[PDB]
């Protein structure tokens, strides 16, 4: 709980509204936020109801120049951005600057796949939803509302998980070597009465 320049949030298993509210409060506090893996955000309510909610959202359009009408964004990252910006005073310079401090992406791009990704417990579905309750996935609602990049993200995420697993195995082996040398070192038992 210390002020970092950039917080990378792995949005897997989170709730859209709860994560948006927490992020919107951090941006007004003046913190750069990168919400990666937005195709895994969870929304309460069963999938058919959520798709009806979204398909009702498409209905809002101008009767003159739908080019000026409401802009319906189908990407899961843009869905999260719409949720976040609705919780911000974006009509003012403060809120407009706050939006510039948020980077919502699909998947985990290489500039952010090699950085620690914290999670928000106040938005996690496992901790915040009663078991036995129906929910949906934004990355699934997006595919059946118009989003057309689901397959590429899934493929590029399988590659990323494979590479990350290889990296962790190498780091775990090095950590095992360091861990083995730990008790071999003597001061770790000689004067460890301080609790370390």
């Amino acid at each position: 709980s210390e002020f970092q320049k950039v917080v990378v949030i792995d949005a897997k298993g989170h709730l859209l509204g709860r994560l948006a509210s927490v992020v919107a409060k951090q941006l007004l506090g003046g913190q750069k936020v990168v919400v990666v893996r937005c195709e895994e955000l969870n929304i309460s309510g069963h999938f058919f109801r959520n798709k009806l909610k979204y398909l009702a959202y498409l209905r809002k359009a101008c009767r003159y120049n739908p080019s000026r009408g409401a802009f319906h964004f189908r990407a899961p990252s843009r869905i999260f951005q719409k949720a976040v910006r609705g919780m911000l005073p974006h009509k003012t310079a403060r809120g407009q600057a706050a939006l510039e401090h948020l980077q919502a992406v699909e998947g985990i791009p290489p500039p952010f796949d090699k950085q620690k990704r914290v999670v928000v417990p106040a938005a996690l579905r496992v901790l915040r939803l009663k078991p036995g309750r129906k929910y949906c996935t934004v990355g699934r609602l997006s595919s059946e509302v118009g989003w057309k990049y689901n397959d590429i993200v899934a493929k590029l995420e399988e590659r990323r998980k494979v590479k990350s697993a290889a990296f962790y195995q190498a780091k775990l082996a090095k950590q095992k070597k360091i861990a083995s040398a730990k008790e071999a070192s003597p001061v770790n038992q000689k004067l460890s009465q301080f609790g370390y």
Partner: protein
Amino acid sequence: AQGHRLYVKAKHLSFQRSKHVIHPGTSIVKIEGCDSKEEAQFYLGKRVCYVYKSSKAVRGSKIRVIWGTIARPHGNSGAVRARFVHNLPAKTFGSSLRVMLYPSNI
């Protein structure tokens, strides 16, 4: 590289305000690490400083500082109220303040 920072970090959140009225005479400050009013009791009376930089060189320095003092806690989540010698600008919302450890009471 790490032998300094005798201060703790803070953010200038907003003016002490109602829904439609703001009072710039006192500001709201969120100290890093402080998460309750009883913890804010320690930081009461400490000297908070707002450090910014400007273009024109005065006294051979780019850095200007505005002093302040933590007065009372604000809410339950650890935020406090701060009073400065000059009221902080409204464009510093979310900027970083440095709460020093003096005047110490321990």
